[PDB]
Amino acid sequence: PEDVFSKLQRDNLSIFESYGTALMEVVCRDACDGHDIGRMLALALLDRIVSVDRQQQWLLYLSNSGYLKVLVDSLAEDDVVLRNLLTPQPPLLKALYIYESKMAFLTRVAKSSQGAIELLRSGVIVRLAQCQVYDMRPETDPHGVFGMRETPVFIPAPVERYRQILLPALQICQLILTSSTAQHLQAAGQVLQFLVAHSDTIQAILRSQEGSLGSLQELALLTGIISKAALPGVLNELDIGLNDGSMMELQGHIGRFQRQCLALLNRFGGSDRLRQLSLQDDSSRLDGVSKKDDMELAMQQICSNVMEYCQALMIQNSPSFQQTVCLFTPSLKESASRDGTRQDSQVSILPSWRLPSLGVVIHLLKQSANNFFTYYDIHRQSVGKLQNVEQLPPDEIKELCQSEMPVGADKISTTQKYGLARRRLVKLINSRAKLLSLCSYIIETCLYILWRHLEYYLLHCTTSDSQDPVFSNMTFGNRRFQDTFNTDPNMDPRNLRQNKVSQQDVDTLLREGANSFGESLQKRLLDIESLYCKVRSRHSFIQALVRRIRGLLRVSRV
Amino acid sequence: STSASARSMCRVLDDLLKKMPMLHTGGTQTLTEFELKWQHWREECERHLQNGTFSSNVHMEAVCRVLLGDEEVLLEKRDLMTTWYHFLVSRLLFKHPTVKPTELHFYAQ
């Protein structure tokens, strides 16, 4: 039976509909032209009404009356004011809260397939690509490790204000790519133009060595935009009359974003994850527990999005089974060297120009399979605590309360303590449920990519030592090129085709593949499918890929 | 249709004019993707001129030099434009198709 809240929401919507265009006009005008606080509340009201409007009447009015275009066009005026907020002594944060309310409302409109189309028609991505505030990334001063300025708790740091500006723009871009399934190429093309307009800032995010929660959220959103926007088919069907020079620059930026996204798998898909999570346990025991769960979620989301990108690149470049793009080198050695407890080898920073090894995919698969059981047990314990909250020890209720309210948890009523404890348990359950879904998706996608690379290297790769020396002499002879000139303009950029794989590399891949994908990992992967995939309608995909990979690794080449 | 000797050159010039990148007021194309296509098209025009493709017809050669934004040939065609602001817009079309509002005064002057 229809829940009482859904009945009341429908009946409330019918009352909004009875006041018609007069109410719509007042709220839309106050959202565009009102005073600072009035604009913020009118935009929050529009976010709420459009969230319940199943018939999209308010969205149709906002588009047809041009208010949606005025709200988008005013982002260029906000840019001038938002730049002034990045100064060490900002003016009043009023423009930031108006921008947040505006971007939250546009993000809400972008959740419907129709609203994403109307936002692309109003030019939202084009106006975002014109805003210079995104290029004003504050330099993180590394010398603040020497103490004694109590930063006054009331003004967010310039880096945090920059994130309050950038994260909503990235969220809209990611949402438009997710909701626009019928116009995916035009949406992807405009979002690519935004990524190219701010390409230095985007490369700075992708290169960031910081382990802060904010830098991980920037990386998680940006990798999820690149995974959806940077599709090879978007460049060939953009009938936008770009001169040949501008297409070469566009391909150049995409090829850099690609290499940098793949380099993130080496950082977050490996042993360095455990060291980044441990180096922050020492500086504050009371504020650290919530930030750890969200950092862990953001790191898993980065790995998921880069694996989604690898999957999408393999699906689109394969109209035929013989033409697989090889994203990973045929080495598994990296998976075997990282199981050892040796803490003291100096960082071989692999340069961002080397392709990751297939060993990284197997290590990520093993790690995601282990983390799945840990998240499953914590999720089950947290659900049991939520059912029995009134039976919890007062010390556990205090720990749950202090995590949502650091100041003053001792002055609140017992009823308020149980309410804070329930909220923390629900956040914990939902965060762990998302980690379980990400681990399942990473496992599925790692198995797919591993299967496709083993299929290519074991069945389709021509080795550099097969056939044969017959005829032609000619001699001579050493020396030196310095200098000089001339044009031939036929550099077709299809030259990613020369990784000379040796027969020794393939034989090592077969032997290391059988050892690294052993019966213990295969059993755990089948146990995960039995615990998780029974309840969500994808029966047998993990079992099918495990059988195919087991097939390929048992083929002795005849 | 009339000139059998000019027909090969007319086909090259028709193809250059047909392939010319145009901006559209509702395209998903970025200004950078447009600039790259426009540069590649301009290199195709320049290659045809350097190869002497039009050397038997001064008028087709002049039209190809106009497509390259040749300022001497644009000024030789002053009488067809009649105004300096038509000359400005022709220069912007063939040299600076991605011109910004902030740069207009410099090009106008």
Q: The tokens of A96 are what?
A: 């930031």
Q: What are phi and psi of A23, to 5 degrees?
A: -70, -40
Torsion of CA A79, A84, A86, A91, to 10 degrees: -130
Buried b or exposed e, range A247-272, using 16+ CB within 10 angstroms: bbbbeebbeebeebbbbbbbbbbbee
CA triple A531-A528-A316, angle to 5 deg: 120
Alpha-carbon span B62 to A247, nearest angstrom:
28
The long-range contacts involving A204-207, CB below 8 angstroms and separated by at least 24 positions, are: A204/A137, A206/A257, A206/A260, A206/A261, A206/A263, A206/A264, A207/A260, A207/A352
Classify each residue of A369-392 as buried b or exposed e, where b means 16 or more C-beta atoms within 10 Å of its C-beta: bebbeebbebbeebeebbeebeeb
Q: Is A249 helix (H, G, I), strand (E, B) or coil?
A: helix
Give whole-number Cα distances, A519 to A302, A358, A428, A513, A516, in Å.
28, 19, 33, 12, 9
Name B36's bridge partners. Answer: A244, A245
> Which residues are CB-contacts of A520 (< 8 A; sequence separation ≥ 6)?
none
Nearest to A516 by CA among A557, A463, A553, A462: A553
CA distances from A193 to A80, A164, A234, A466, A474 (A): 21, 22, 12, 45, 51
> With an 8 Å Cβ cutoff, are A241 and B35 in contact?
no
Residues A102 and A170: beta-carbon distance below 8 Å: no
- Strand, helix or coil at A329? strand
Structure-determination approach: cryo-EM
Residues 6+ apart with CB under 8 A from A528: A369, A372, A373, A439, A440, A443, A542
> DSSP secondary-structure letter at A145?
G
User: Do A222 and A170 meet the contact criterion of CB atoms below 8 Å apart?
Assistant: yes
Q: Which of B17, B18, B23, B30 is the mutation pick for testing A, counting most A CBs within 10 A?
A: B30
Full 3-state SS string of A450-466:
HHHHHHHHHHHCCCCCC
Give me the torsion for CA of A242, A245, A247, A248, rounded to 10°.
180
Instruction: Return the exposure string of A282-298: e unless at least 16 CB atoms fall within 10 Å of the residue's CB, then b.
Output: eeeeeeeeeeebebbbb
| Contact criterion met (CB below 8 Å) for A313 and A451 | no
3-state secondary structure of A540: coil
Count CB pairs under 8 A between chains A and B.
Answer: 102
The alpha carbon of residue A123 is apart from the nearest alpha carbon of chain B, in Å, by: 9
Q: Which residues of A touch B26 (CB under 8 A)?
A: 121
Q: Is A130 on the interface with B (CB under 8 A)?
A: no
Cα–Cα distance measured from residue A58 to residue A23, given in angstroms and rounded to the nearest whole number: 10
Alpha-carbon distance of A87 to A306, in angstroms, equals: 34
Quick check: helix, strand or coil at residue A357?
strand
Please report, as a single letter, which amino acid is at residue A392.
L
Tokens of A409: 């948890």
- Determine contact: A237 vs chain B, CB below 8 A: no
Rounded to whole angstroms, the Cα distance separating A379 from A431 reads 9
Characterize A346-362 residue by residue with b for buried, 16 or more Cβ atoms within 10 angstroms of its Cβ, and e for exposed.
eeeeeeeeebbbbbbbb
- Interface residues from chain B to A (CB-CB < 8 Å): 20-24, 26-43, 97
Sole residue written with tokens 């320049």: B46
